[PDB]
Enzyme design. Sequence first.
Site, PDB file in Angstrom:
ATOM      1  N   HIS A   1       0.811  -1.220   0.000  1.00 63.34           N
ATOM      2  CA  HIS A   1       0.000   0.000   0.000  1.00 63.34           C
ATOM      3  C   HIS A   1       0.851   1.279   0.000  1.00 63.34           C
ATOM      4  O   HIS A   1       0.313   2.380  -0.164  1.00 63.34           O
ATOM      5  CB  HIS A   1      -1.039  -0.015   1.122  1.00 63.34           C
ATOM      6  CG  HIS A   1      -0.502   0.314   2.477  1.00 63.34           C
ATOM      7  ND1 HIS A   1      -0.403   1.607   2.938  1.00 63.34           N
ATOM      8  CD2 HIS A   1      -0.104  -0.481   3.497  1.00 63.34           C
ATOM      9  CE1 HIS A   1       0.062   1.596   4.174  1.00 63.34           C
ATOM     10  NE2 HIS A   1       0.254   0.340   4.538  1.00 63.34           N
TER      11      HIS A   1
ATOM     12  N   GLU B   1      18.853   7.781   8.264  1.00 66.25           N
ATOM     13  CA  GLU B   1      18.087   8.940   8.729  1.00 66.25           C
ATOM     14  C   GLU B   1      17.802   8.900  10.220  1.00 66.25           C
ATOM     15  O   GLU B   1      17.490   7.844  10.767  1.00 66.25           O
ATOM     16  CB  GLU B   1      16.737   9.011   8.009  1.00 66.25           C
ATOM     17  CG  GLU B   1      16.818   9.440   6.553  1.00 66.25           C
ATOM     18  CD  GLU B   1      16.967  10.936   6.390  1.00 66.25           C
ATOM     19  OE1 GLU B   1      17.304  11.597   7.384  1.00 66.25           O
ATOM     20  OE2 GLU B   1      16.741  11.456   5.281  1.00 66.25           O
TER      21      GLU B   1
ATOM     22  N   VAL C   1      16.388  17.375   8.438  1.00 67.97           N
ATOM     23  CA  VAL C   1      17.722  17.970   8.545  1.00 67.97           C
ATOM     24  C   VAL C   1      18.776  16.992   8.041  1.00 67.97           C
ATOM     25  O   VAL C   1      18.727  15.811   8.378  1.00 67.97           O
ATOM     26  CB  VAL C   1      18.040  18.312  10.015  1.00 67.97           C
ATOM     27  CG1 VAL C   1      19.449  18.907  10.145  1.00 67.97           C
ATOM     28  CG2 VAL C   1      16.976  19.262  10.589  1.00 67.97           C
TER      29      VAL C   1
ATOM     30  N   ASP D   1       0.142  -7.656   1.877  1.00 66.62           N
ATOM     31  CA  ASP D   1       0.600  -6.263   1.872  1.00 66.62           C
ATOM     32  C   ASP D   1       2.119  -6.184   2.014  1.00 66.62           C
ATOM     33  O   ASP D   1       2.656  -5.846   3.080  1.00 66.62           O
ATOM     34  CB  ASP D   1      -0.098  -5.471   2.979  1.00 66.62           C
ATOM     35  CG  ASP D   1       0.125  -3.978   2.864  1.00 66.62           C
ATOM     36  OD1 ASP D   1       0.635  -3.521   1.819  1.00 66.62           O
ATOM     37  OD2 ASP D   1      -0.236  -3.260   3.826  1.00 66.62           O
TER      38      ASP D   1
ATOM     39  N   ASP E   1       0.854   2.226  19.773  1.00 65.49           N
ATOM     40  CA  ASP E   1       0.546   1.661  18.453  1.00 65.49           C
ATOM     41  C   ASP E   1       1.370   2.345  17.364  1.00 65.49           C
ATOM     42  O   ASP E   1       1.957   3.402  17.594  1.00 65.49           O
ATOM     43  CB  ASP E   1      -0.951   1.870  18.156  1.00 65.49           C
ATOM     44  CG  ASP E   1      -1.522   0.888  17.129  1.00 65.49           C
ATOM     45  OD1 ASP E   1      -0.786   0.040  16.577  1.00 65.49           O
ATOM     46  OD2 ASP E   1      -2.741   0.992  16.871  1.00 65.49           O
TER      47      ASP E   1
ATOM     48  N   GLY F   1       1.824   7.127   8.522  1.00 64.51           N
ATOM     49  CA  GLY F   1       3.206   7.483   8.220  1.00 64.51           C
ATOM     50  C   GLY F   1       4.209   6.426   8.646  1.00 64.51           C
ATOM     51  O   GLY F   1       5.351   6.458   8.206  1.00 64.51           O
TER      52      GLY F   1
ATOM     53  N   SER G   1       3.465   3.266   8.088  1.00 61.66           N
ATOM     54  CA  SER G   1       3.199   2.300   7.026  1.00 61.66           C
ATOM     55  C   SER G   1       4.459   1.822   6.340  1.00 61.66           C
ATOM     56  O   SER G   1       5.296   2.633   5.962  1.00 61.66           O
ATOM     57  CB  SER G   1       2.324   2.950   5.961  1.00 61.66           C
ATOM     58  OG  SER G   1       0.997   3.096   6.413  1.00 61.66           O
ATOM     59  N   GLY G   2       4.575   0.509   6.172  1.00 60.42           N
ATOM     60  CA  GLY G   2       5.685  -0.083   5.437  1.00 60.42           C
ATOM     61  C   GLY G   2       6.924  -0.333   6.274  1.00 60.42           C
ATOM     62  O   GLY G   2       7.850  -0.997   5.820  1.00 60.42           O
TER      63      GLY G   2
END
Length: 223
Positions: free
Chosen positions: A40, A52, A57, A84, A171, A175, A177-178
């Site tokens: 998705h 990251e 920044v 998924d 939880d 954002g 996601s994945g």
Amino acid sequence: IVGGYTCGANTVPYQVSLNSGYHFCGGSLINSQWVVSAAHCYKSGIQVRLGEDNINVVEGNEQFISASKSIVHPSYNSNTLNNDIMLIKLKSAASLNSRVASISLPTSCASAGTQCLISGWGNTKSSGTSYPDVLKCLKAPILSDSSCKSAYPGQITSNMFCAGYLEGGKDSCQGDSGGPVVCSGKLQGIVSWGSGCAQKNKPGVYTKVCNYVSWIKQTIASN
Ligand SMILES: NC1CCCCCC1
Ligand SMILES: [Ca+2]
């Protein structure tokens, strides 16, 4: 991540940010040239951002590498979110180090009760919206198939598991996601779906990675 903690810079070295002008999804580095994410999260024009912490920044440990191809699972159903999972190949191999490192695939499926680490740059509020710039972490147990199915009648397939807390408050969220669910040093889950975030009796639902190891290995071997 709702109800989590600040991970610390580069403490989750397999965590990637998928960027198309902006962060839109997490992913997991599984070797120097491949990332696993959620189906998705599929879109064109993906740049993979490794190393990251603060995604707003440039802090000095980043590698920015464009995707050369994405491969969504052949059986992904966007309505039910069954299967998924998606693979993303980098245009060039990442330089692996202590802060940018691959995460091992499972050799076996993780059991209910196993403690895992879930991470991402998603929303930190269960009502309203606040996006952190730095990576957030959550320690959470895998829930039993029966409790998962009871929480989400008619929606949990053999390719999904619940992780988190039936009491709510902690939880994954929009954002995230994945992104990774890592248990005992293995990638066992991908942040997939849920009904809101951190709501009572609505734990996060995750793609069951151990079911896809053969597909991942074979796909990587021919692409
Ligand atoms: N726990 C889920 C995270 C994936 C995106 C939907 C929000 C809730
Ligand atoms: Ca950065």
